[PDB]
């Protein structure tokens, strides 16, 4: 009835005055109490181009306390620019399955990404720990898990864009989640990510398909591209690719047909199945469903 004690449910028209009414019920349906989250802001477990992430305490239908990281929002400082955010990604409501990172709430200057906590952090920090000792058939079984998640994202006609080891994070039971996407897309690492000039659009090109540097026409054919370069990552256990190949000349490398070499420790059948994810024609890659069929039996065989 007030300025000052709106009911929560309202305080989306408040302090988001800037959203499609649209979106307003869709960010309406996942509104966290501020009562209901503690959010520690004396250590920050994650940083992002939008804003840091920070470990936090969500309360639920019972007193339980389920551990979180919490996005925070506080550098996009534009407030339209917020809305937009929110526009793109609110759709992550809609998704669940287990190799796919959830959406726990949003909280209420900028808005709260709150999401569940990953004990074990991202895909690719964890295969490069020196003191981590997973073997062949664990890494691909990492390969297997994205390829679930992915096909699941590809059935919802939803391009992810930003598929790679880095962009994947594993639970304390080493469930891995295919994430930054939606509430959750931001920069983790900047160092291989090009800014377009015209379109602001962020460019990972170790990751990017040949007509996607051609284009920014990003498909679900383009990301089949991404998850090979993942496989790649897996088998190398986080290498960067293209060593030799700086961000210019990458198009010129993969328009003579050169493509990432074979690691020393990568089955000859799942090296092939790289191959056929980035082959030039993008309607002739394996589909996810297909990527799933292939790895598991790769997975399963020795
Ligand atoms: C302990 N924990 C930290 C979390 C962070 C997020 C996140 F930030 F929101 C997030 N969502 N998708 C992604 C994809 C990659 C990374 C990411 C972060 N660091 N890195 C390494 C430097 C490159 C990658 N984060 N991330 C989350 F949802 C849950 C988390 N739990």
Same mark, same amino acid.
């Given at each position: 009835?007030?300025?000052?004690?709106?009911?929560?449910?309202?305080?989306?028209?408040?302090?988001?005055?800037?959203?499609? &009414?649209?979106?307003?019920?869709?960010?309406?349906?996942?509104?966290?109490?501020?009562?209901?989250?503690?959010?520690?802001?004396?250590?920050?477990?994650?940083?992002?181009?939008?804003?840091? %992430?920070?470990?936090?305490?969500?309360?639920?239908?019972?007193?339980? *306390?389920?551990?979180?990281?919490? *996005?925070?929002?506080?550098?996009?400082?534009?407030?339209?620019?917020?809305?937009?955010?929110?526009?793109?990604?609110?759709?992550? +409501?809609?998704?669940?399955?287990?190799? %796919?990172?959830?959406?726990?709430?949003?909280?209420?200057?900028?808005?709260?990404?709150?999401?569940?906590?990953?004990?074990?952090?991202? !895909?690719?920090?964890?295969?490069?720990?020196?003191?981590?000792?997973?073997?062949?058939?664990?890494?691909?079984?990492?390969?297997?898990?994205?390829?679930?998640?992915? +096909?699941?994202?590809?059935?919802?006609?939803?391009?992810?864009?930003?598929?790679?080891?880095?962009?994947?994070?594993?639970?304390?039971?080493?469930?891995?989640?295919?994430?930054?996407?939606?509430?959750?897309?931001?920069?983790?690492?900047?160092?291989?990510?090009?800014?377009?000039?015209?379109?602001?659009?962020? !460019?990972?090109?170790?990751?990017?398909?040949?007509?996607?540097?051609?284009?920014?026409?990003?498909?679900?054919?383009?990301?089949?591209?991404?998850?090979? %370069?993942? !496989?790649?990552?897996?088998?190398?256990?986080?290498? &960067? &690719?293209? &060593?030799?190949?700086?961000?210019?000349?990458?198009?010129?490398?993969?328009?003579?047909?050169?493509? !990432?070499?074979?690691?020393?420790?990568?089955?000859?059948?799942?090296?092939? %199945?790289?191959?056929?994810?980035?082959?030039?024609?993008?309607?002739?890659?394996?589909?996810?469903?297909?990527?799933?069929?292939?790895?598991?039996?790769?997975?399963?065989?020795?």
């Amino acid at each position: 009835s007030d300025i000052s004690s709106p009911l929560l449910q309202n305080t989306v028209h408040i302090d988001l005055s800037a959203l499609n &009414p649209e979106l307003v019920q869709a960010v309406q349906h996942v509104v966290i109490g501020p009562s209901s989250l503690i959010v520690h802001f004396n250590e920050v477990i994650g940083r992002g181009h939008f804003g840091c %992430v920070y470990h936090g305490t969500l309360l639920d239908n019972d007193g339980k *306390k389920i551990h979180c990281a919490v *996005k925070s929002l506080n550098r996009i400082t534009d407030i339209g620019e917020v809305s937009q955010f929110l526009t793109e990604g609110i759709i992550m +409501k809609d998704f669940s399955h287990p190799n %796919v990172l959830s959406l726990l709430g949003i909280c209420l200057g900028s808005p709260l990404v709150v999401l569940p906590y990953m004990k074990h952090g991202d !895909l690719r920090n964890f295969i490069r720990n020196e003191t981590h000792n997973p073997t062949v058939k664990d890494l691909i079984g990492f390969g297997l898990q994205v390829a679930k998640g992915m +096909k699941y994202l590809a059935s919802k006609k939803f391009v992810h864009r930003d598929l790679a080891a880095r962009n994947c994070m594993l639970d304390e039971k080493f469930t891995v989640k295919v994430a930054d996407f939606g509430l959750a897309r931001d920069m983790y690492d900047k160092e291989y990510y090009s800014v377009h000039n015209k379109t602001g659009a962020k !460019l990972p090109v170790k990751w990017m398909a040949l007509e996607s540097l051609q284009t920014q026409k990003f498909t679900t054919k383009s990301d089949v591209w991404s998850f090979g %370069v993942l !496989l790649w990552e897996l088998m190398t256990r986080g290498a &960067p &690719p293209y &060593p030799d190949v700086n961000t210019f000349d990458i198009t010129v490398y993969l328009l003579q047909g050169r493509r !990432l070499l074979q690691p020393e420790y990568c089955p000859d059948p799942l090296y092939e %199945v790289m191959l056929k994810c980035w082959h030039p024609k993008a309607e002739m890659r394996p589909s996810f469903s297909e990527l799933v069929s292939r790895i598991s039996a790769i997975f399963s065989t020795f």
